[PDB]
DNA sequence: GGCTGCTTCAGTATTTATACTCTCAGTAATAGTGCTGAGCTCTTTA
DNA sequence: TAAAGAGCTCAGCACTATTACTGAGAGTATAAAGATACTGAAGCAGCC
């Protein structure tokens, strides 16, 4: 009904990758759309953790330019 | 009054120069908008 | 001395009212401005 536990959702969202195995990005976007989640009201749904690995894998995949590398 | 030759048509093999005037109209973007929380503010006395 | 109140106000997602603003409309009264070829098929056309 209500699913406001962020770190529990971390346990559930690692299930996405560790189970499916595409990437943390696509796994959690799949989560966001499955339960119909916007992108500004997420801090109430998403563990504080997965965000950091998301940033990591993002910059490592080079999603943005050198303008973002130095910082 | 039924009757044959011409006939006409129909089927094959990029990139277009000069309104005007409101006048309104209702719209979609857009700033005004107020929360939530939360994080620092602050003092308390144990 | 320092764990622990109760509040002072600043990130961070909306909302209503807005403001260019683009569209729909209604006025407009000098003129006179082309080198197939073939086969075929009904219709038309003149006749005993």
Question: What is d(CA A46, CA A53) in angstroms, rounded to the nearest whole number?
Answer: 13
| Dihedral pair phi/psi, residue A10, rounded to 5° | -65, -45
A28 in Cβ contact with A16 (< 8 Å): yes
* Cα→Cα distances A54→A21, A35, A58, A63, Å: 14, 19, 6, 11
- Specify the resolution in Å: 4.5
Q: Please tell me whether any atom of strand C lies within 7 Å of the Cβ of A38.
A: yes
DSSP class of residue A50?
H
Q: Which nucleotide is nearest to A40 (CA to C1')?
A: C13
Longest CA span, chain A: 43
SS3 A21: coil
Question: What is d(CA A43, CA A29) in angstroms, rounded to the nearest whole number?
Answer: 14
Q: How was this structure determined?
A: cryo-EM
Q: Which two tokens stand for residue A4?
A: 């406001």
Q: Please tell me whether any atom of strand C lies within 7 Å of the Cβ of A40.
A: yes
Distance between the alpha carbon (CA) of A10 and the C1' atom of C35, Å: 83
């Amino acid at each position: 009904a209500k699913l406001l536990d962020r770190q529990e959702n971390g346990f559930i969202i690692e299930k996405m990758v560790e189970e499916f195995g595409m990437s943390y990005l696509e796994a959690t976007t799949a989560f966001l759309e499955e339960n119909s989640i916007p992108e500004t009201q997420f801090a109430k749904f998403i563990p504080s953790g997965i965000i950091e690995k998301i940033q990591s894998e993002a910059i490592d995949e080079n999603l943005l330019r050198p303008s973002v590398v130095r910082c």
